[PDB]
Amino acid sequence: KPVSLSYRCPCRFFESHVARANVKHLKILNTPNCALQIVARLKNNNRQVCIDPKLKWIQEYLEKALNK
Numbered sequence: 001k002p003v004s005l006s007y008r009c010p011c012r013f014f015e016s017h018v019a020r021a022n023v024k025h026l027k028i029l030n031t032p033n034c035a036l037q038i039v040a041r042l043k044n045n046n047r048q049v050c051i052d053p054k055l056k057w058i059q060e061y062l063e064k065a066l067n068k
Contacts, residue, residue: 007033011050014038018049020057 010029014037024041031037038051038058051058 009034009037010039011037014050014052015040016052016055018042018051018055018057020061026061 009031011034018040022042022044024043024046027039029037029039036053038053039048040051041048053059053062
């Protein structure tokens, strides 16, 4: 069977509404054949989700992470 395997990404979707208060750990994963995937694990849900870079607290996060 001819099967086309795409360049697999750690994320498929990105959460577009995440609470900083519910984030365990922030991890941003740039992937050579994929988009810029942000990864965060939830505290109350404890599941590791994906985050969209254009979130408001995320823009702040990137800015202040680069600023320090």
